Every structure is written in C-alpha cells, then in structure tokens.
Design a protein around this ligand. Sequence first.
Ligand SMILES: *[C@@](O)(C=O)COP(=O)(O)O
Ligand SMILES: *[C@@](O)(C=O)COP(=O)(O)O
Lengths: 336, 336
Amino acid sequence: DVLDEQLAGLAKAHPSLTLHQDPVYVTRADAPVAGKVALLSGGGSGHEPMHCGYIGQGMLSGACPGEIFTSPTPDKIFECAMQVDGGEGVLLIIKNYTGDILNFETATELLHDSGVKVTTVVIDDDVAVKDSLYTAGRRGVANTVLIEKLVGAAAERGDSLDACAELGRKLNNQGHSIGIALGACLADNEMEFGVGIHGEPGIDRRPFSSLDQTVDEMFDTLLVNGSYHRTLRFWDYQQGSWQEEQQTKQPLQSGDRVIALVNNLGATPLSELYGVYNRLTTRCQQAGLTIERNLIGAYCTSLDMTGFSITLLKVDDETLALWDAPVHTPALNWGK
Amino acid sequence: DVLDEQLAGLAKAHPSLTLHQDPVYVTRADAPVAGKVALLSGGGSGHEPMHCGYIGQGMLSGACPGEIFTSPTPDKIFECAMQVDGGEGVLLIIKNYTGDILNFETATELLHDSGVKVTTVVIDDDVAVKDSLYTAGRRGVANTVLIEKLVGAAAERGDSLDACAELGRKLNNQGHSIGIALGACLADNEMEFGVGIHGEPGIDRRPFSSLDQTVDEMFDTLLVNGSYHRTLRFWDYQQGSWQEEQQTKQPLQSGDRVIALVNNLGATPLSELYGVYNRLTTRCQQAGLTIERNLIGAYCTSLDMTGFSITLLKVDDETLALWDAPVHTPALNWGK
Ligand SMILES: *[C@@](O)(C=O)COP(=O)(O)O
Ligand SMILES: *[C@@](O)(C=O)COP(=O)(O)O
C-alpha cells in the first residue's frame, strides 16, 4: 500500500510525530499535552503538507488523513481526539465538504457521548462557487492552514476551548481564497478559474494570457465575492446538540490589514509564486490593503495539479501576535 | 521582465533580504556583517529556492541569480561579494558547470585584484555522468544546499576563511547525489535516469516500474559510483593563483552516518517524497548506513520538472552540530 508507505515515511522522517495504527492517525509524540486545549483536523490525503505537516507545538495536536481526496472515517477521528485530549477539551477544525462534515460531525457526537468536551469550527473560505460538487455552501481550502496556526497559538498559550472556537469562527469569517489550475492532478493555454482542491470545477474555463492578468482576475474576485451570509452548524457541548448559527463575512476593504498566503497547488515553480506575490502586493496597495505578513510555498496542495491559490485573511494586532507566536511543525517553524 | 518581477516579489516577501540593482544580486539586509567570513553562491534562476532562499543568518550572506539556467555574469558576483565583505574574507561556493566555473573564477580574480581576500569551493556531487554537456567532471547539484548550511554554520560562529573553505571541500568529498525525471521542465512510462538540474541527459532512459524500484536503482547507483579522484582548482589568495588540487571521494559504506536530502526537482507531490524516504531508510538500514538527519522537500529544483533526487552526505558529530546550529532563511528555519 502506497499510502501506508507514505505515512511510514512521514513517521520515520519526524520523530516529533507518532503514527498510530488500528486505526491510523498521527499525533504529536508528546500528546496528550495536559492542561491545554487539543486541536485536531484531517481530510483526504493528497493535500500534503495539510494536515500532517502542521502537527506540533503551537499548531495541531494531531491529524487524521484519509484515502486520497477522501475524508477519514469517524473511528479515526474519535481515536485521534481521545489520544490528544489534555483534559481541556478538543477543538475539531473541519473543511467544508460533504464527506468531511458528515464524518467529523459523527465523530463529534461519539466523542461527546464518551464524555469528551468537544466543539467544532467549519472552514468555508473558497469564494469561487457556492454549492460545488461535494460541498453545501463554500469550499474549505488554504485559509484552513492560517486558522490552524492562529488557533494553534491561542491553544498553546492556554486559551479555553470556547475562546479557541470563537477565534476560529471569527477568522473563518475574515479569510477569503481563490485558486486556479493550468493543468489537473486539459485545454492548452486555458485555465480552470476558481478550481477546488480535489479537482472540482471552477467558475469557468477561461484563457490564460499571463501571470499578472491571472492574479488580477483572482484578486478582483476576492474583492467582489467577499460578502457572504450562511448557516454553519457547531456542536454545543452544554446542550449536546448541533446549533445552527448564521455567520456573516464582510468584503475585504480599503484599510484592512491582511496576512497573504500564495499557495502552490502542486506543480507551480516557486519562482512563479514570487511573481504572483509581486503582483498581489501591487494590487493590495492600490486597494488600500496592507499585507502585514505572508507565506509563499506549497501549504495546501492537490497532488501534482499545476496551479496556485491566493488567500487574504483580515487581521488585527492581537491576531498578528498569534501569528508571530512560536510554531514547531514539519511544514512551519519559527521561534519568538 | 518576468525575472525582474520574481526577484521584486522575493524582496517584498522578505524584509530580511535586500535586492540590489545595477547590477542585480541579493544580500542579507544586515550585510555586511563585520568580523565574520561572508558566504556567497549563485547560478541560473530556475532552481528556487536555491540559492536566494538560503540567504540569512547561519547560511548565505548573499546570492547571485542569473537568467534561467544561466550563470550570473562576473560583475554581479563581484559586486555582491563587495557588498557582503565583512573584512574576514569571502568564500564562494560554485556548482561545477562550465559557465558557473568561468564566471565565478573571473569574479574571484577581480575581487583578489581589488584587495578582497577570497577563496572557493567547487561542488561536484552528482554521481551520474562524468563530462556532461555543460560540465568538466561531475555536476554540482543538491548537496550544494547541505554544504551551504554546514559551512554557513561554521562561518556564522566565527570560523576562519581557511577553516570554512577546508570544511566545504571536505564535505564536497563526502556527499553523493543522483536525480531522475519522469517529465522534463518525453517517453511515457520511461524515466531519464541520472538527469541534471538544467535538463542535461542522464545515464540513460529506462522504464519506470514503481517508486520503490526507482529508489532502489538510485540508491544502488550512489553506492557503486561513490569512488572518485579528480582535480578541482581553488583560489590561493596568498599566492594570487589557481591551485590544482587532487581530491578524493570514498564510496559510501557500512558504518557511515549520513544526512539524507530527498529533493523535489519541481512537480513531485510531497506525499511521493515521503514514500521515497520510506524506501530510502530501508535501503540505508540494509547497507549499514545510519541516517541521522533528513530534509524532504523542494530545495534544489529544475523549474517544473517532474522528478526528484536523493543526496546522502557522510557526517560526524562535529558536522551534525553544524547541521543543528541555528539557521534563519526563507527556505530553512530552526534554532535547534
Ligand atoms: C478532501 O480531501 C478534503 O478533505 C476530501 O473531501 P470529501 O471526501 O470530498 O468530503
Ligand atoms: C545552472 O543553472 C547552474 O547554475 C546554470 O549553469 P551553466 O550556465 O550551464 O554553467
């Protein structure tokens, strides 16, 4: 089994991680870490390093990879949550896809019934399409990485489950993403505009003229598709039931301070991502957006798809302090 | 100009770097750093993050990117060296290619003639082909990255120019690499075995059967092509002349301790690199090689080539302490 070989490789390469079997999931070698909220996510394999490369201090306590582009089953999520539970509750970050919501929601209920204090955060940052192939609402993509880091920092500093959940939901309402593909993981000089991370169709197929023009279209779309009202359910652990909550996003606007993530979907040369970033900085400056921090590289991929995404997340001083906080994971590492 | 855009993007993304114009090169924003040996390298663009992503504390003082797959001109190298010169000498790391050797050697003479104490280290780690299209001897490839980190740590801590040069030369005789391509940046189910980083042909074209079988062929080749005797010239700054020095490499053998670098040449998914690493650890264990540290990711690329390389570098306790020493660059970051 190739997936078995890949996870074995991950484990051998990173002694800070523990690979579990029966069922398979990955945790920090030091979990459970007593006295801190534990943070967990997961989803299909094929988006590496999301989510296993984000396991470590200041980020995820553990993650649950599934088969390629397929959500992990509920047993994996339940066992991973039980293993990382430090007695202060477990926060589940769930990307918005039919399969992930179903499986993570089922695990949430199993956890609650086993006495674990748990709650959830749903990620729906992809501004391209409402009601895609495998999503009710908007797709969860690269902003998931930014939210994992920020909520990770808050959990590491000792914030409560409620505080971490509330921060995650607020960040979700302030982050906006869009991706394009020049080739699947199929048209020649044409791009799939607003593509999804498991290959879902975008807004349309349109001609690729240049990098700068593609970035302009992506950026313009982030500015005009920002406004969004929708229901996102979260687990209320006090009542032991799903709570329907109306959630609102405001469009990105002049005067906003943002973190920018220019993300390789798989086979885009890093030199090109820097070209993207150069045009993005120009457009942000023209629109009154101040990019305060950035990440450029392969953070939320789709196998070997040729393409990239842009994520802009609105932030303030407190959120920037959470960004600057230490993180020690395979894919992201910085100290004070 | 696209390269101009990509370099502007790199500079905007990293306040720790300074992009210079007339001529173009990149340095640490804090260079010149007084009292420490300055370390520089360069070469064609198209290998990002090599070398610009290695500029920072514990690594390069600066780098000189050229046009795609083309050495920078001698004025870029000279001016970059003068900008970073901290009064204790400049060490130039040169990958073994006709153009790079000619240009860095010309810059070396100009520096010497301008009063700057300088010396060189040539990297010739690719075991696949001797006397490729653009190289006299063996090609300089991914081990260049490991050497910049290790010699970068030595310079950072205050080692002398001679000590840093001797270390670089010793490490060059102990690092061995090989790369394969499944697609250029041409055959279907076939691979170019022993491919070079600017697209140079390899040993041959052969069938691709599986990932594990490919790793086996690559690993076997590193074990059997290790032995090597050749001349590498270096700049003797006391005499003001090139010194022809015979240099010897021993094959990798049972009992060796190594750092392993599994490197994406451009479009190989990270998941697959972990599978490569998994098989590599098995082969190393069988051969009596102990892998003490690893790096898995995109570190020395070839635009969007689909393929990867494996590098094994023999090390001892002193070299592993240099590996673990602090580094703060765009591509490599750790304080332990
Ligand atoms: C995708 O890999 C994100 O986790 C898997 O989602 P679905 O299986 O489509 O829910
Ligand atoms: C290649 O990008 C390594 O720097 C460029 O080498 P040559 O110009 O072929 O020497």
